[PDB]
Design a protein around this ligand. Structure first.
Ligand SMILES: CC(=O)N[C@@H](C=O)[C@@H](O)[C@H](O)[C@H](O)CO
Ligand SMILES: O=C[C@H](O)[C@H](O)CO
Ligand SMILES: O=C[C@H](O)[C@H](O)CO
Lengths: 334, 332
């Protein structure tokens, strides 16, 4: 296994790669100019110490900001339209707030809450102009709840956890499928077109479970309400015993790993470090030597396809969070 | 150059991490909270997130059930001058790090010290003798901690105290009385903090830290009344205060305020103040990375005030550098 020192060095290598190729307007080196290519940029580069590069992304994001606090364009990927439209918005809010861009995050978080379903506590999956039926998913709700934490809107975070709690206990067939979406009225949306994770198979989408586990663990730390800890503990046990191991192998397993590392610092259970260390080590070995993570690229490239840039900035963040909670976990418990 | 200011901050952060204690404490010769209250925030901005979380672990083990850290404390200024100065940086550092339980409890206690009649924050801690007086530094850092934790109403109330303190100055061209009583009237007695604005006797951060907080509140709110008061305090330090206002060790607050004001307004005088202070702080840096007024050798620890100044300059040079680079870009 690799140590938190080595998980961190892998994070700083990718963060160096990004800063080397950042555009003068602040955009990260994406082959296509879309918001889903750099929405984790402010947060990731801040945790890596590249604050001027993170502030540059904040300048690029601010110049794209609409009067209502949203960035509806440039968007291309289908998932950032009607699957989890607020995935970009949630990371933008956290990254702007930790940077001290209080005007940016306040406007981003204001719009995020305009998407909240007051009847259920979830957040709408499709953007204002995107066709949809008002469905709310676990990813939009957990990332908005996490963004609610960093901005101090704890009541919104609490209402988001109620949605995830109701979504968990409403699972009709949890051993075979995880329905990560509810309709606009609070019922678990078991429709064919709704996101549903095939648990016993190896077909990705695990972060629809891992990100709620991350959010719920953070809200527990914020509140020490055991209801949030028990629900996060269930989701982790669910992904460990009931889920196919691809839940900890697929590219979206970093959310589970961050949650396990957080849970280890908060509980001291050794299996949480096991899941956290194995996931963090797994992502380290996949890193290209130039710093970036990618699926098809292997050479000294000057830019990346939008999915690889986002994955690269996402792994700077996940390896850092896992590394700092494993390090603090040993100090506290061991 | 924002590039050079950042490298100086990363060298001081490297110096701190290389000497951090196994329990998370920064290398202070005395185990006191005033030696490392800026450690969580400073190390996080430098990328040393494992070292920042270690400070969070050490701070967490000191937290009392009401959210304060009354011990270990030794410096009088962290007893009855601006007691909450330590708590303010602890709250911010804990929050940007994700330690929401640590930051919420710290912020909860800070708010119990707010004076609801004036919006100011009590200068002396619970155990410490005093008369309910509130100072501009306790109020500014509490307001900035409130902004980072989303307590905007508490921040707006802190600015109201600063605005009341400002227009209430009985003699601003000769002295800045930074304290008011519990009733809201400016305290002019000799025991109150008073900046002799025409003498090189330090304590300028009683004006500069208000200017920083008020500028950040303006960005959070776009209420130009906060920008105007921030502008008046920056003009006050530039034209009416001694040049030591931008030379004393406590000038980093005005520099960060100027760097932030430059990004928001674009007036190049704010860029001059930020660069001048930033390069000044850069030139005072020892080659090993730490900042000290006495030490020059390769030391394994520092006097608590030198260790705090070292972490403080990590943050200020980063803030000054990030706002000058972004200020250069938007006003290109
Ligand atoms: C660099 C500097 O002069 N900083 C000032 C405030 O931040 C100073 O008052 C410090 O707090 C010092 O530890 C004494 O209190
Ligand atoms: O890198 C992956 C992106 O987050 C998106 O989910 C596309 O797969
Ligand atoms: O040690 C130097 C600090 O800046 C301060 O003077 C301590 O009181």
């Amino acid at each position: 296994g690799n140590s938190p020192h080595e998980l961190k060095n892998a994070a700083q290598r990718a963060a160096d790669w990004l800063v080397e190729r950042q555009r003068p307007n602040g955009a990260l080196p994406s082959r296509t100019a879309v918001i889903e290519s750099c929405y984790k940029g402010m947060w990731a580069l801040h945790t890596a110490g590249h604050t001027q590069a993170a502030s540059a992304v904040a300048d690029y994001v601010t110049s794209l900001l609409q009067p209502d606090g949203d960035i509806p364009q440039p968007r291309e990927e289908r998932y950032f339209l009607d699957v989890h439209y607020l995935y970009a918005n949630g990371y933008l809010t956290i990254g702007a707030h930790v940077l001290g861009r209080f005007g940016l995050s306040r406007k981003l978080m204001s719009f995020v809450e305009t998407m909240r379903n007051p009847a259920t506590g979830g957040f709408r999956s499709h953007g204002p102009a995107i066709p949809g039926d008002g469905r709310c998913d676990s990813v939009s709700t957990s990332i908005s709840g996490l963004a609610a934490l960093y901005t101090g809107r704890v009541d919104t975070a609490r209402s988001a956890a109620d949605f995830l709690g109701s979504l968990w206990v409403g699972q009709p067939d949890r051993k075979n499928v995880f329905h990560a979406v509810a309709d606009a009225s609070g019922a678990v949306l078991t429709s064919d077109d709704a996101v549903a994770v095939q648990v016993r198979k190896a077909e990705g989408d695990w972060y629809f479970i891992g990100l709620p586990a991350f959010f719920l663990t953070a809200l527990y730390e914020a509140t020490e309400d055991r209801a949030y800890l028990d629900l996060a503990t269930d989701l982790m046990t669910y992904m460990d015993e009931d889920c196919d191991e691809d839940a900890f192998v697929d590219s979206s397993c970093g959310k589970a790993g961050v949650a396990a590392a957080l849970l280890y610092r908060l509980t001291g259970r050794p299996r949480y470090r096991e899941i956290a260390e194995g996931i963090g080590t797994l992502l380290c070995e996949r890193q290209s030597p130039y710093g970036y993570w990618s699926e098809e690229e292997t050479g000294d490239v000057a830019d990346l396809f939008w999915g690889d840039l986002d994955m690269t900035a996402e792994y700077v963040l996940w390896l850092d969070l896992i590394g700092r909670n494993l390090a603090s976990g040993e100090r506290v418990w061991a």
